[PDB]
């Protein structure tokens, strides 16, 4: 089997416990913490592209009320984010397996934007997800992995100061 783990899941779990928030901006704000993925069971000599995207974990708009997050009362079906291609893509099994795969450069925006940046729906909750796409071979293949530990709400500003505190402590 191809095996796909989360690096620094303990760091991530400290945020999940509080309800994680990622800042989103006109031009795009990078993520903290950064999604880092351990990957074994690739073909060292095969070709893979690493895709990242962001599934609306539910169909609700969220709001900060009496110091806690709660869902609105009007679900819209959510489209998944556009895909961000890891820049080491495409690359050999052995590249992706030799060190953790960092998506340190992904930028999250809330605006109708040019390129690079991934536009998210403000105040919706997102599950990060990666697609390992085997390329070059005669048969294209996809393996997808979601990361519950890395769930967050897209915010223009931090609401829970406890999150802000953690973001500065571990940055
Ligand atoms: C119903 N609308 C949407 O699903 C939507 C809106 C704005 C940004 C994103 C990113 C992914 N989906 C989005």
From Swiss-Prot:
Transmembrane segments: none
Residues in the DNA-binding region annotation: 11-171
MF-aspect GO terms: DNA-binding transcription factor activity; DNA-binding transcription factor activity, RNA polymerase II-specific; RNA polymerase II cis-regulatory region sequence-specific DNA binding; RNA polymerase II-specific DNA-binding transcription factor binding; sequence-specific double-stranded DNA binding; transcription corepressor activity
Expression tissues: Detected in testis, but not in other, normal tissues. Detected in lung tumors (at protein level).
GO terms classed as biological process: anterior/posterior axis specification, embryo; cardiac muscle cell myoblast differentiation; cell fate specification; heart morphogenesis; mesoderm development; mesoderm formation; negative regulation of transcription by RNA polymerase II; positive regulation of transcription by RNA polymerase II
Subcellular location, record wording: Nucleus
Domain of life: Eukaryota
Keyword flag Transcription regulation: yes
Effect after changing residue 131 to R: In SAVA; reduced DNA binding activity; increased cell growth; altered expression of genes involved in ossification and notochord maintenance
Keyword Coiled coil appears in the UniProt entry: no
Cysteines engaged in disulfide bonds, as pairs: none
Keywords, alphabetical: Activator, Developmental protein, Disease variant, DNA-binding, Nucleus, Transcription, Transcription regulation
GO CC field: chromatin; nucleoplasm; nucleus
Subunit structure: Monomer.
Task of the protein: Involved in the transcriptional regulation of genes required for mesoderm formation and differentiation. Binds to a palindromic T site 5'-TTCACACCTAGGTGTGAA-3' DNA sequence and activates gene transcription when bound to such a site.
Involvement in disease: Neural tube defects: Congenital malformations of the central nervous system and adjacent structures related to defective neural tube closure during the first trimester of pregnancy. Failure of neural tube closure can occur at any level of the embryonic axis. Common NTD forms include anencephaly, myelomeningocele and spina bifida, which result from the failure of fusion in the cranial and spinal region of the neural tube. NTDs have a multifactorial etiology encompassing both genetic and environmental components. Chordoma: Rare, clinically malignant tumors derived from notochordal remnants. They occur along the length of the spinal axis, predominantly in the sphenooccipital, vertebral and sacrococcygeal regions. They are characterized by slow growth, local destruction of bone, extension into adjacent soft tissues and rarely, distant metastatic spread.
Record-given protein name: T-box transcription factor T
Biological source species: Homo sapiens
Lineage summary: Eukaryota, Metazoa, Chordata, Craniata, Vertebrata
Gene behind the chain: TBXT
């Amino acid at each position: 089997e191809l095996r796909v783990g989360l690096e620094e899941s303990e760091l991530w779990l400290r945020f999940k416990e509080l309800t994680n928030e990622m800042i989103v901006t006109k031009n795009g704000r990078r993520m903290f913490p950064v999604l880092k993925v351990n990957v074994s069971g690739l073909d060292p000599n095969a070709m893979y592209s690493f895709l990242l995207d962001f599934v609306a974990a539910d169909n609700h708009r969220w709001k900060y009320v009496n110091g806690e997050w709660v869902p609105g009362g009007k679900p819209e079906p959510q489209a998944p984010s556009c895909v961000y291609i890891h820049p080491d893509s495409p690359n050999f099994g052995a590249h992706w397996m030799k060190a953790p795969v960092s998506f340190s450069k992904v930028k999250l925006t809330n605006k109708l934007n040019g390129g690079g940046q991934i536009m998210l729906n403000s105040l919706h909750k997102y599950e990060p997800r990666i697609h390992i796409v085997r390329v070059g071979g005669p048969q294209r293949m996809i393996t997808s992995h979601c990361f519950p530990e890395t769930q967050f709400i897209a915010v223009t500003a931090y609401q829970n100061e406890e999150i802000t505190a953690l973001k500065i402590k571990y940055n």
